[PDB]
Amino acid sequence: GSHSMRYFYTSVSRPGRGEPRFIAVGYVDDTQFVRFDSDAASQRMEPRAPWIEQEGPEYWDRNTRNVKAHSQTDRANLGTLRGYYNQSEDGSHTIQRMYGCDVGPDGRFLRGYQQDAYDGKDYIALNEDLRSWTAADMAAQITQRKWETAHEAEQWRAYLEGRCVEWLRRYLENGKETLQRTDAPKTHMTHHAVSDHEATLRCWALSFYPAEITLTWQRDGEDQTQDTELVETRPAGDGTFQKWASVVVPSGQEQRYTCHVQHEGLPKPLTLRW
Amino acid sequence: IQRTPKIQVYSRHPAENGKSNFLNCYVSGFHPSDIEVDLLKNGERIEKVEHSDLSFSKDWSFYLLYYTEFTPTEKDEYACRVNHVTLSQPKIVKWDRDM
Amino acid sequence: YVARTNIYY
């Protein structure tokens, strides 16, 4: 199908307890493959999936060098922002950044992203044309002006339309078994009675990959959202995911309710009934 | 603005007594990223507990998986204990085989 | 593959 590769950077300041901390992680789809941690002893980019381990020493050295320069900048960027926003040094603050690219089933560029957040709120983002930026407030306008003069957009464009796309394709090939599978959800339904008048139906999906999935309830074939609960999709720890949806129904009416499971590993959506 | 963690405690595979498994505590949707997570066996902290690398969702909130290997029994109660700036006291979420 | 881009604020 389609595929994506993202890097997620998190920088945090620790006033009164030390210098900032920078953590980077890299994903292909819902599978993590690298990490870097400025607090850790190794000070190298580390493998986090079997299929990246085969990359050679210059791969690891160049990735380490690149992420170390970002680590150093973003750790300094915390002091910059605290000055733009006139924040007291008493406060602990956060810079986040996501960037990466999607490709279609032909392996070719669809879309690329670069988005930054300061304390969980949008700061600056690269627009879809990869040539201009959207600043969120007057502080991020300072950064926008700096980046537009120095022409930093087209370096992002080159990376996002070239190197990102091309190594995503390499990783997709090297980790064929892991990354290009669809593990169909294994489903079942539980039932929990607390009293005589009311029972909870729970629809389960286990062992599925990719993470994208939809569970919906129906009564008599009609959609039903009243009295339903849906938990966050959650990792099993073995590369698959889990999810459930539940509904409270009056006793005796269980038979009318259907759970519906849509996942790209299922040729036809599943239908389950108590 | 700060967002409090959602907590889910659960096993890697369907829990069958005597059969080895992994106990998971997944915390998602929180900001900021500093968080304390411990896994409990009958109220005692479990020692060899690993966790995943810090990452975040499209809405910028963070998620972490804490996990340790374990063998469930009829009698042993497991739980996950979570502290965060948005929580006044550590929240304890017991493991029920049905959530 | 990590990008070699600039991100100073």
Numbering used by the authors:
A (entry chain A): 1 to 274
B (entry chain B): 1 to 99
C (entry chain C): 1 to 9
Question: What sentences appear in the manuscript?
Answer:
To fully understand the specific features of peptide presentation by HLA-A*2601, we determined the four crystal structures of HLA-A*2601 complexed to SARS-CoV-2 T cell epitope peptides EVF and CVA and two peptides from HPV: DVM and YVA. The structures of HLA-A*2601 complexed to the three 9-mer peptides (i.e., DVM, YVA from HPV, and CVA from SARS-CoV-2) revealed diverse conformations of the binding peptide in the median portion. For the other three peptides, although CVA, DVM, and YVA are all nonapeptides, they show different conformations with residues in P6 or P7 of peptides as the secondary anchors. Actually, peptide YVA in HLA-A*2601 also performs a similar conformation with CVA, while P7-Ile as the secondary anchor. As in HLA-A*2601/YVA with P1-Tyr and HLA-A*2601/CVA with P1-Cys, due to the absence of negative charges, Arg62 and Arg163 of HLA-A*2601 are not drawn toward the P1 site. As a result of repulsion between Arg62 and Arg163, Arg62 rotates upward, moving away from the PBG, causing the “open” conformation of pocket A. In the structures of HLA-A*2601 complexed to EVF, CVA, and YVA, the PΩ position is occupied by Tyr, forming hydrogen bonds with residues Asn77, Tyr84, and Lys146 in the HLA.
